[PDB]
mmCIF file of C-alpha atoms and ligand atoms in Angstrom:
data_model
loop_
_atom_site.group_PDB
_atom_site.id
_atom_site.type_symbol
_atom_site.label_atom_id
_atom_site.label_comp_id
_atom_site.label_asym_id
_atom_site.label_seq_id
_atom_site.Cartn_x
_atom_site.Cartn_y
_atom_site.Cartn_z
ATOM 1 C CA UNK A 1 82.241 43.409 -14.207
ATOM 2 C CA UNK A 2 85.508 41.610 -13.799
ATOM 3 C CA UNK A 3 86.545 45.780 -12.324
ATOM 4 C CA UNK A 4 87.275 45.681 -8.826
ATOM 5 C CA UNK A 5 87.901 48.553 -6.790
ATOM 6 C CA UNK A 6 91.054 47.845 -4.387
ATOM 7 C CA UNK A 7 92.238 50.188 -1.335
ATOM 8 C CA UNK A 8 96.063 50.644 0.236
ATOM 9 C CA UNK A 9 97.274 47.945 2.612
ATOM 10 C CA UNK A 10 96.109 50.559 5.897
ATOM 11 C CA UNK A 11 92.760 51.512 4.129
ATOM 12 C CA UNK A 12 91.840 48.350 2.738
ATOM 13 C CA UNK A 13 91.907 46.892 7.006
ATOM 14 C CA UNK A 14 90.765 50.333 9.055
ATOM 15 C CA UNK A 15 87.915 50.331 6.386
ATOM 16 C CA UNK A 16 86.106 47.393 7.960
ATOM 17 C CA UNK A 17 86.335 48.960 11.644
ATOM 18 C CA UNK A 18 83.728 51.453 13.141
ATOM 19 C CA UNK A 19 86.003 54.360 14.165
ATOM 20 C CA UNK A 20 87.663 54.039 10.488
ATOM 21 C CA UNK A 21 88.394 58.226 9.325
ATOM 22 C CA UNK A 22 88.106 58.890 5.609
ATOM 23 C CA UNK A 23 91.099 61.024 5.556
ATOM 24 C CA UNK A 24 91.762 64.331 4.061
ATOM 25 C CA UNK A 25 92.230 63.601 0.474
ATOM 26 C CA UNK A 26 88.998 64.747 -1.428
ATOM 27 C CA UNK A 27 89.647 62.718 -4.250
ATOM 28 C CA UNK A 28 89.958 59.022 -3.085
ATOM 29 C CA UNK A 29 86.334 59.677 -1.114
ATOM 30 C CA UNK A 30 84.387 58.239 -4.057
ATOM 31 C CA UNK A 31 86.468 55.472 -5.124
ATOM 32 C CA UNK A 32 86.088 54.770 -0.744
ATOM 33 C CA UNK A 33 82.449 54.551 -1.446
ATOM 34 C CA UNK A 34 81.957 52.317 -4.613
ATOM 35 C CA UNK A 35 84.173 50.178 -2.740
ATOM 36 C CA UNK A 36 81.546 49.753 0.184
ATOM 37 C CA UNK A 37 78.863 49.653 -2.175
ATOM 38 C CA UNK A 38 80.840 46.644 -3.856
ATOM 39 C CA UNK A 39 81.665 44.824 -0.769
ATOM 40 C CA UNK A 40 78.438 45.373 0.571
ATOM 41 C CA UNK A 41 75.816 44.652 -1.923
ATOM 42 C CA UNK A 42 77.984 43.365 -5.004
ATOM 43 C CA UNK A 43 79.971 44.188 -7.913
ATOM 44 C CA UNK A 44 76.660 43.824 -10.206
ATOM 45 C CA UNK A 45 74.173 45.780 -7.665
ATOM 46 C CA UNK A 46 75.092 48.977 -9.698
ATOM 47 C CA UNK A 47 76.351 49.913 -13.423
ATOM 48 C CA UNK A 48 79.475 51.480 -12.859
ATOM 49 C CA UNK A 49 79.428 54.099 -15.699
ATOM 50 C CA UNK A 50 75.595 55.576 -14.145
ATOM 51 C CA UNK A 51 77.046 54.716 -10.183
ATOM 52 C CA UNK A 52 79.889 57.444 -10.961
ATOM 53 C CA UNK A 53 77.961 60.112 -12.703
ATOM 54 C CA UNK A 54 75.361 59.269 -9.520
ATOM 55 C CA UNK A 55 78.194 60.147 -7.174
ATOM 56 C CA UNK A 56 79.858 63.159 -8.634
ATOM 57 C CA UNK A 57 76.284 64.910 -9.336
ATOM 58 C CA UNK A 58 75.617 63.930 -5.586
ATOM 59 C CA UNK A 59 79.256 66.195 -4.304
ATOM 60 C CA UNK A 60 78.140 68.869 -6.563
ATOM 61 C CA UNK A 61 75.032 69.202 -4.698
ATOM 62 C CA UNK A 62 76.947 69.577 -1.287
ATOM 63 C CA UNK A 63 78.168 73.049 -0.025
ATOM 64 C CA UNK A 64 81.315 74.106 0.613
ATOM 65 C CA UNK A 65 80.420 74.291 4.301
ATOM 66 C CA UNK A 66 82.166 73.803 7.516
ATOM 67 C CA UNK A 67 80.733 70.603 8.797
ATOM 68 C CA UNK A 68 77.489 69.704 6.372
ATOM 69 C CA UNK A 69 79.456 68.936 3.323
ATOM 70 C CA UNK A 70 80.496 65.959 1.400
ATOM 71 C CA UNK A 71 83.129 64.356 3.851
ATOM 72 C CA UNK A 72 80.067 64.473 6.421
ATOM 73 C CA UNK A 73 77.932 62.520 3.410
ATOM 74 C CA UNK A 74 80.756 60.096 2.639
ATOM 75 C CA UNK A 75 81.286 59.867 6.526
ATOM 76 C CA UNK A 76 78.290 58.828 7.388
ATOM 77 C CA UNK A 77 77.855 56.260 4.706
ATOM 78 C CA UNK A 78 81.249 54.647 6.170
ATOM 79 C CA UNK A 79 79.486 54.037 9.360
ATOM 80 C CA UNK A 80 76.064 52.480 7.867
ATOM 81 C CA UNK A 81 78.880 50.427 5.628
ATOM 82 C CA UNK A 82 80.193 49.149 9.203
ATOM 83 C CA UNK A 83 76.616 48.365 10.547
ATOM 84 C CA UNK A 84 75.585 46.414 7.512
ATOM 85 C CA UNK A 85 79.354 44.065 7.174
ATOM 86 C CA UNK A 86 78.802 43.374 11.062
ATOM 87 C CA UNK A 87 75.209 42.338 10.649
ATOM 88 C CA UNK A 88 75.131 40.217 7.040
ATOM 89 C CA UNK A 89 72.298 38.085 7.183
ATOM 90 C CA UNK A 90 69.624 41.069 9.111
ATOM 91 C CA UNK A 91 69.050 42.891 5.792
ATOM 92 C CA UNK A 92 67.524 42.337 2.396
ATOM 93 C CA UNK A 93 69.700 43.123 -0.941
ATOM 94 C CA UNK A 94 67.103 46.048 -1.439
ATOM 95 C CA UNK A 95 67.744 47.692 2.449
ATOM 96 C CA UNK A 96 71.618 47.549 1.842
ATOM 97 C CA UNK A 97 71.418 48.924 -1.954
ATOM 98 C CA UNK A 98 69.361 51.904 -0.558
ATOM 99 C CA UNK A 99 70.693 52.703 3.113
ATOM 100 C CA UNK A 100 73.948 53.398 1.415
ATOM 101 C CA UNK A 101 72.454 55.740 -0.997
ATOM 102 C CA UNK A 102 70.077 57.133 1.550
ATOM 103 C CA UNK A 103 73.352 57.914 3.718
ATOM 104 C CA UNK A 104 75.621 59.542 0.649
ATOM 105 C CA UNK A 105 72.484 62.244 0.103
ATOM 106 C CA UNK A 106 71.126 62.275 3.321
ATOM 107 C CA UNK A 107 71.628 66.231 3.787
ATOM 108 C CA UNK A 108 71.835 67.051 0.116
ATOM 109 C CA UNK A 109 72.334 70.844 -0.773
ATOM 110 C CA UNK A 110 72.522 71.803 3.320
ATOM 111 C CA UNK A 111 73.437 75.514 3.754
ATOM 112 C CA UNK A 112 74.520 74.710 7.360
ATOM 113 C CA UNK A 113 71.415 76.128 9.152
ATOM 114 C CA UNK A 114 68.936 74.235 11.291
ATOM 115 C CA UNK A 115 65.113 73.502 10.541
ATOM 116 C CA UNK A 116 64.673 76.208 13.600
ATOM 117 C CA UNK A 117 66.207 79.025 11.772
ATOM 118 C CA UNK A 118 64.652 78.327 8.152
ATOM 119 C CA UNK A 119 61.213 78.905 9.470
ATOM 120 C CA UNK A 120 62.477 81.969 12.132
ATOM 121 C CA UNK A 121 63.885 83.413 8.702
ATOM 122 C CA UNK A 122 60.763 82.631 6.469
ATOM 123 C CA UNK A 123 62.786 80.533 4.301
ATOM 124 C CA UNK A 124 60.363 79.444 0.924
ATOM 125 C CA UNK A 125 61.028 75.755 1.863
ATOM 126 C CA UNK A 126 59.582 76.322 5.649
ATOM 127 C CA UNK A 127 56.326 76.708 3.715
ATOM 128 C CA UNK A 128 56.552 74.211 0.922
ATOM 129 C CA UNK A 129 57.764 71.569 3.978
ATOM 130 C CA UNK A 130 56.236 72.524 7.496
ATOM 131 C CA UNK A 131 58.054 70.126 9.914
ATOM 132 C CA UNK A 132 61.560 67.679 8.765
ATOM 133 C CA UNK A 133 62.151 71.294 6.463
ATOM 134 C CA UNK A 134 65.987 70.343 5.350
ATOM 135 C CA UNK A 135 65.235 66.629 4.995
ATOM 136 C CA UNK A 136 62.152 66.342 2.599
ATOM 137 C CA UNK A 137 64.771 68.685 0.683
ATOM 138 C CA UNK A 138 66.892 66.279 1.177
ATOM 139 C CA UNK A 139 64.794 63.177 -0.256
ATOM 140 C CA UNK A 140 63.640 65.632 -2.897
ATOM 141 C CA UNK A 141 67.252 66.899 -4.090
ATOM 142 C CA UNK A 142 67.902 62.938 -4.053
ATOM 143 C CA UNK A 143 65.023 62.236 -6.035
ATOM 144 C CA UNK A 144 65.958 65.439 -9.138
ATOM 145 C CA UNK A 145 69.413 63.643 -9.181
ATOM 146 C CA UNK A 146 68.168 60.006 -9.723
ATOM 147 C CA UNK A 147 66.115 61.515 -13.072
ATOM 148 C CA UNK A 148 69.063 62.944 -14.528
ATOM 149 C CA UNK A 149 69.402 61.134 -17.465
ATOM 150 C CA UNK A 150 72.394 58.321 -17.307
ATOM 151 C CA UNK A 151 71.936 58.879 -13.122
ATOM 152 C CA UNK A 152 68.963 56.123 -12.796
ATOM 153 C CA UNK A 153 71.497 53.707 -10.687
ATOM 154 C CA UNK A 154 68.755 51.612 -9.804
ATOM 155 C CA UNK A 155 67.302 51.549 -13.538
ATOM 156 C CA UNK A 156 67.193 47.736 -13.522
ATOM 157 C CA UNK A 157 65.113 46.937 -10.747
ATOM 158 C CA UNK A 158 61.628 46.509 -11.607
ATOM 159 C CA UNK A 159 58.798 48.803 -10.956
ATOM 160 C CA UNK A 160 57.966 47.092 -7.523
ATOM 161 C CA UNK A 161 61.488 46.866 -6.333
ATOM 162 C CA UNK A 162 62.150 50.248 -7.325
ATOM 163 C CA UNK A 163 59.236 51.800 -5.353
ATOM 164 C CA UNK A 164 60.725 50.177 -2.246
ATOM 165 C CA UNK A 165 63.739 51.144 -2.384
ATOM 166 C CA UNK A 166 62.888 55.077 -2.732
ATOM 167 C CA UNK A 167 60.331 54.408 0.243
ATOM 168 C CA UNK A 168 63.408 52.757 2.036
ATOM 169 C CA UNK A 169 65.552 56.101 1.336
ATOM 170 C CA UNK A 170 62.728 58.695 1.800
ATOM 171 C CA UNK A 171 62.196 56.932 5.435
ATOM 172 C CA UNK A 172 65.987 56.669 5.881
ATOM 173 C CA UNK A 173 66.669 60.441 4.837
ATOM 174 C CA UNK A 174 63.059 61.698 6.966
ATOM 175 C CA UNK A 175 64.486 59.629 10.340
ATOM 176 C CA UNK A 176 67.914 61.899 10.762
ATOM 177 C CA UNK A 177 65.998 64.605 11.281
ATOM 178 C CA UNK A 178 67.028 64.690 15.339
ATOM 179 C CA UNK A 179 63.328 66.223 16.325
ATOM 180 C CA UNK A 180 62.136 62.283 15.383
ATOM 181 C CA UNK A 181 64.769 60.557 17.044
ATOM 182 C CA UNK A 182 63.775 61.112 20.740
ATOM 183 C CA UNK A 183 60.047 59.443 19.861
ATOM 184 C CA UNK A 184 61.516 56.799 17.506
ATOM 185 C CA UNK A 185 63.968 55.577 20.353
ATOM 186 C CA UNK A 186 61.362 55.737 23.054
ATOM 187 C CA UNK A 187 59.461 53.196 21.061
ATOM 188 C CA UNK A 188 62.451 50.688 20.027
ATOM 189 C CA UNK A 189 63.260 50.845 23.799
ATOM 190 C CA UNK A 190 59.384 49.789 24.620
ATOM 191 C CA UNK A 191 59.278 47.089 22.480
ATOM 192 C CA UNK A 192 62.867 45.721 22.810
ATOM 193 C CA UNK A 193 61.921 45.400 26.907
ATOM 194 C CA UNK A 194 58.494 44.155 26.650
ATOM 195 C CA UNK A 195 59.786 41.637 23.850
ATOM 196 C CA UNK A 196 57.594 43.082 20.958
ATOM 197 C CA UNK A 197 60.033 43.791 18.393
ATOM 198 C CA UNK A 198 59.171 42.048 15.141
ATOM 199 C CA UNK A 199 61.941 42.408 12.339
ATOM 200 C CA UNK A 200 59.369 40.512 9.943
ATOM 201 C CA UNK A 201 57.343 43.536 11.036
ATOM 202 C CA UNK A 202 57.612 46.470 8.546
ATOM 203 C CA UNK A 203 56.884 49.128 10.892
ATOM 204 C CA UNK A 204 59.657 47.854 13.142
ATOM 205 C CA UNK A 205 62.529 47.481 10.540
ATOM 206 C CA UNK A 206 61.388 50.660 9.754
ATOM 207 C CA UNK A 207 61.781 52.021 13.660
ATOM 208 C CA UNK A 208 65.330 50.244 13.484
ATOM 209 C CA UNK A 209 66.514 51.200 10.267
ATOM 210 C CA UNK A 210 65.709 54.893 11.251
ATOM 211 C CA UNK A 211 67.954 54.610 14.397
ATOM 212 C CA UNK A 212 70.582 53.680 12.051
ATOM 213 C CA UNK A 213 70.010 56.251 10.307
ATOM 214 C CA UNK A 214 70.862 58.601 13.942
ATOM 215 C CA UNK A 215 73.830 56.661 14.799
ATOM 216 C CA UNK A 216 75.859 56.756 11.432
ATOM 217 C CA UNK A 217 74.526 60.904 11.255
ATOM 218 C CA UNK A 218 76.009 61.319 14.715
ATOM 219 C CA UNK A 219 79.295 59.254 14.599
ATOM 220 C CA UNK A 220 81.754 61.896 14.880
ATOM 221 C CA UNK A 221 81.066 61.061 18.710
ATOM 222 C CA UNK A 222 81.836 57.053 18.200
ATOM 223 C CA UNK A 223 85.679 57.965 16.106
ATOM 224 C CA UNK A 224 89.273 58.497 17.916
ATOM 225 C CA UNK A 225 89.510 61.405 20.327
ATOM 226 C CA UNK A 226 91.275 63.591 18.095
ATOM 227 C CA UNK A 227 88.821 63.215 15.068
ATOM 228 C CA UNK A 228 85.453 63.711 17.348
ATOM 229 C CA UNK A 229 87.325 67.008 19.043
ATOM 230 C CA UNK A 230 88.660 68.463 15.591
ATOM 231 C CA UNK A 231 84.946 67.744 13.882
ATOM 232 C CA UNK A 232 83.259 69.115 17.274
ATOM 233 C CA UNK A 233 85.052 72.766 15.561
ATOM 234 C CA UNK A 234 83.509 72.081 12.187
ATOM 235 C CA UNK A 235 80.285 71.400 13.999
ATOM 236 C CA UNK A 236 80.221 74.564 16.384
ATOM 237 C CA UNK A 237 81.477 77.105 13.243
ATOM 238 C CA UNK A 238 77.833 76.515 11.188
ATOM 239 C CA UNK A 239 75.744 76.210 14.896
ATOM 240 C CA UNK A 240 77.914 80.132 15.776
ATOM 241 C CA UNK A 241 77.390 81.588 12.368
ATOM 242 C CA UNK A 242 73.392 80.183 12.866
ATOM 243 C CA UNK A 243 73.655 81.932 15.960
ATOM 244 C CA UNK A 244 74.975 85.205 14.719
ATOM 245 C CA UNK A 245 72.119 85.466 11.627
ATOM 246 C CA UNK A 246 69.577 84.280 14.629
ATOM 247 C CA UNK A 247 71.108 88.130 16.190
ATOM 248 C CA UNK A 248 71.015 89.826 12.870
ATOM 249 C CA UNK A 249 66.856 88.666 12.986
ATOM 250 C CA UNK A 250 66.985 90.526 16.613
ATOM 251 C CA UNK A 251 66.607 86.774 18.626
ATOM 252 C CA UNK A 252 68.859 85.968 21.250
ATOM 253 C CA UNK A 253 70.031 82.216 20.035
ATOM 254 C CA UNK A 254 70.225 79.173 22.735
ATOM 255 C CA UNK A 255 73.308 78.847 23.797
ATOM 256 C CA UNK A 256 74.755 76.554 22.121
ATOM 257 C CA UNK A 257 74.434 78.714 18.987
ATOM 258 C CA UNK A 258 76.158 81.877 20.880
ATOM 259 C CA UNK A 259 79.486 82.353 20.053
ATOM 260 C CA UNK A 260 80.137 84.107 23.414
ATOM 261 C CA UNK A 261 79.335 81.082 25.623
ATOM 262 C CA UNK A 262 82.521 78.911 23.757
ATOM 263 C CA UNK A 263 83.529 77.871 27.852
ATOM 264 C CA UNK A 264 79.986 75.495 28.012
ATOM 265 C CA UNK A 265 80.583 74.029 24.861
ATOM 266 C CA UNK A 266 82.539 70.771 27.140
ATOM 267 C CA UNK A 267 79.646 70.891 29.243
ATOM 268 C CA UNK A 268 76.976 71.077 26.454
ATOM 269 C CA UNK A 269 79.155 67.925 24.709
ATOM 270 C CA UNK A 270 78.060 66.083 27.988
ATOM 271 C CA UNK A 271 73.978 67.093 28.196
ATOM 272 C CA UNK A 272 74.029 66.003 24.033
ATOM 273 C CA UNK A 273 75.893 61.992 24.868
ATOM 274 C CA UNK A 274 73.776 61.607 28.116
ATOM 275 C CA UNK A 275 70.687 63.281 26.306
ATOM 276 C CA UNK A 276 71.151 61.784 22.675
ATOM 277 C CA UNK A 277 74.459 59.767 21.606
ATOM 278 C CA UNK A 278 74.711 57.073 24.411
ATOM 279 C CA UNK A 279 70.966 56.426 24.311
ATOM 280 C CA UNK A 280 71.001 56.183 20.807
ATOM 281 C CA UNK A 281 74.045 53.547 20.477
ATOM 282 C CA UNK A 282 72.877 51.780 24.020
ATOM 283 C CA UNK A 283 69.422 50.993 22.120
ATOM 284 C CA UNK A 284 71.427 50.002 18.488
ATOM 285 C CA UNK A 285 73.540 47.569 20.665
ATOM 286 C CA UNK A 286 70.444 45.621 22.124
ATOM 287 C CA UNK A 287 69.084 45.355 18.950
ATOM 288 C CA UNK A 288 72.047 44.739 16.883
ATOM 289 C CA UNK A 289 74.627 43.591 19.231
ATOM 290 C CA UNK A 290 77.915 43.457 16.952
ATOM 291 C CA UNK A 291 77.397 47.648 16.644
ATOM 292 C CA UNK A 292 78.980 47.505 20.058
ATOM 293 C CA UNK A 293 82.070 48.871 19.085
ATOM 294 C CA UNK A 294 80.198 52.296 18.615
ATOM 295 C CA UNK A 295 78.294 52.745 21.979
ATOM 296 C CA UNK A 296 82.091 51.445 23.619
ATOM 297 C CA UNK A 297 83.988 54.338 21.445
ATOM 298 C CA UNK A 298 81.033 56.911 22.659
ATOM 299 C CA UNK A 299 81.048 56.334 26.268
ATOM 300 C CA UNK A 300 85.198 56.726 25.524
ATOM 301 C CA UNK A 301 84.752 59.914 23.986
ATOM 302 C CA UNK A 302 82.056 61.144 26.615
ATOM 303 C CA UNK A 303 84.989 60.090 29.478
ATOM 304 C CA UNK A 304 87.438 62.638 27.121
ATOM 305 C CA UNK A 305 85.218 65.734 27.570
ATOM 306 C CA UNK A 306 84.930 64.997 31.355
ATOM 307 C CA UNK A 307 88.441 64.805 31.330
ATOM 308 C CA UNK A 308 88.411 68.438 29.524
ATOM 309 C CA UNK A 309 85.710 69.952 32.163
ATOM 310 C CA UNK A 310 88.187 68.721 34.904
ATOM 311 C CA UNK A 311 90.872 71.424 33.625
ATOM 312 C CA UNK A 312 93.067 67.364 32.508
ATOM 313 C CA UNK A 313 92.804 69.223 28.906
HETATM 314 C C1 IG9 B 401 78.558 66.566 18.544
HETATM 315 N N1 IG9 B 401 77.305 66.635 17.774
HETATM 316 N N2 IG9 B 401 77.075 65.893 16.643
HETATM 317 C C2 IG9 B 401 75.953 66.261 16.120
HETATM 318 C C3 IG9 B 401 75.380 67.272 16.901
HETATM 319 C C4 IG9 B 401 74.060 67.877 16.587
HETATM 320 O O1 IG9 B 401 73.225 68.130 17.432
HETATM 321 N N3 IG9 B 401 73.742 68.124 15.323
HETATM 322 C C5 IG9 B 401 72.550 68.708 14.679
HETATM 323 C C6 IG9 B 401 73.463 69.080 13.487
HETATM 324 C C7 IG9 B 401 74.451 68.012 14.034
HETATM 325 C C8 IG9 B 401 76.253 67.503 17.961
HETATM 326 C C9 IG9 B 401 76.100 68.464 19.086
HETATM 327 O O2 IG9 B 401 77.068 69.023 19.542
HETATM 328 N N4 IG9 B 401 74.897 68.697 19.612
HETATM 329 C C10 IG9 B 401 74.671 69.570 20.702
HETATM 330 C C11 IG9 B 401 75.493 70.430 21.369
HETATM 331 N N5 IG9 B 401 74.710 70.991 22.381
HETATM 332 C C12 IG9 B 401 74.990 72.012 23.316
HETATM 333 C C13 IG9 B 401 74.028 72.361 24.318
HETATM 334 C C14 IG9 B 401 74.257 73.408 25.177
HETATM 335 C C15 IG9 B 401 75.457 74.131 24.945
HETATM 336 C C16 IG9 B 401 75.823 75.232 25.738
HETATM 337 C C17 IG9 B 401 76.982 75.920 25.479
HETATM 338 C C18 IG9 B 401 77.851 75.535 24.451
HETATM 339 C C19 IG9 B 401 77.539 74.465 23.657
HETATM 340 C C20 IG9 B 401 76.346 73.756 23.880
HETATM 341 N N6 IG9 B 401 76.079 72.717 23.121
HETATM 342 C C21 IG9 B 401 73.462 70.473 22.268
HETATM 343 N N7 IG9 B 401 73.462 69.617 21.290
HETATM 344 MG MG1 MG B 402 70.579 66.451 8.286
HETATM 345 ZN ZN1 ZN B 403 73.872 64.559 8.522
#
């Protein structure tokens, strides 16, 4: 109750800013999270006792991989925490209790392989989950965790409320599955520029929440130069070592997921922020226009890897 989470001087500032890195130090990651979820949604939103077994049964459930692992959960919450402080008044106490949640288990027991090679490989879930494969695993994983008992963080909501809010996640967790993106954006851009959009229309918040939902999963691109190069690593090691099982099935992978064409990889960086990232945070700002920061920080970054291409570094 009268328990308040407090950060360092540095932390307790750079928290509140887009571009904001977690830092290296595993162990303050939750305390960084209960302290969005207080500042965002309140100190009573959650019981804190069933809110911490929630979050240390959600990092047991993430792989020790190279870039889909719990700093990439905890990351990725940060940003949605930034979207929701700059925009107060947009969303209901239900949408900012579950986009947080939706964001911490959003790729919940990932083994660092795409949907693509999953059903290449025959995977079981490819057939229990034909198309969004990894994310309805996601939802589901999120959904096992929740009935744990003591884990039931939104226990105290009542039976309406509490079927809303897992809709609100299982849309949220569905949406960051990048095959949906490219449709979803087409139709925010449609409506935005004819004048359609409706955010008393459920099928629109939906449209916009799920863009969200692609802008905090891809903000690696939106941080300081340094941080967006040293995650594009983490990022290429799982895409390589997809790559290299794609060979061991006797496929040639694309090339982004061949080792052996590392020299594209600054040209690639530009195709994915013309092709995904800029669109994606160009459309956020025109809906939401104090997420600004973000499509400013990307078009920074995208300037870096031209920089790189030109031999500069
Ligand atoms: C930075 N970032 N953040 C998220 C993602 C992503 O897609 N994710 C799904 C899991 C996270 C990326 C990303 O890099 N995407 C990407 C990179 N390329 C390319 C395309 C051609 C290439 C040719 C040669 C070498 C490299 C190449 N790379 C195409 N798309
Ligand atoms: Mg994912
Ligand atoms: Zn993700």
């Amino acid at each position: 109750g009268l328990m308040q989470f407090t950060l360092p001087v540095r932390l307790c500032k750079e928290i509140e800013l887009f571009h904001f890195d977690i830092g290296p130090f595993e162990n303050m990651w939750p305390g960084i999270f209960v302290y969005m979820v207080h500042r965002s949604c309140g100190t009573s939103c959650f019981e804190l006792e069933k809110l911490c077994r929630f979050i240390m049964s959600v990092k047991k459930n993430y792989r020790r991989v190279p870039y889909h692992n719990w700093k990439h959960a905890v990351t990725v919450a940060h940003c949605m925490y930034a979207i929701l402080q700059n925009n107060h008044t947009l969303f209901t106490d239900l949408e900012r209790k579950g986009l947080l949640i939706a964001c911490l288990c959003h790729d919940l027991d990932h083994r660092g392989f795409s949907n693509s090679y999953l059903q290449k490989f025959d995977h079981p879930l490819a057939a229990l989950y034909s198309t969004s494969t990894m994310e309805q695993h996601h939802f589901s994983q999120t959904v096992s965790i929740l009935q744990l008992e003591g884990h039931n963080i939104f226990s105290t909501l009542s039976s309406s409320e509490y079927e809303q809010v897992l809709e609100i996640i299982r849309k949220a967790i569905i949406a960051t599955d990048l095959a949906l993106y490219f449709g979803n954006r087409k139709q925010l851009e449609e409506m935005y520029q004819t004048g359609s959009l409706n955010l008393n229309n459920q099928s629109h918040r939906d449209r916009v929440i799920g863009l969200m939902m692609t802008a905090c999963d891809l903000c690696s691109v939106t941080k300081l130069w340094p941080v967006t190069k040293l995650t594009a690593n983490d990022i290429y090691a799982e895409f390589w070592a997809e790559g290299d099982e794609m060979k061991k099935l006797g496929i040639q992978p694309i090339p982004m997921m061949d080792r052996d064409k590392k020299d594209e990889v600054p040209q690639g960086q530009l195709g994915f922020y013309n092709a995904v990232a800029i669109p994606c945070y160009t459309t956020l700002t025109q809906i939401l226009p104090p997420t600004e920061p973000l499509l400013k920080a990307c078009r920074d970054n995208l300037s870096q890897w031209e920089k790189v291409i030109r031999g500069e570094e």
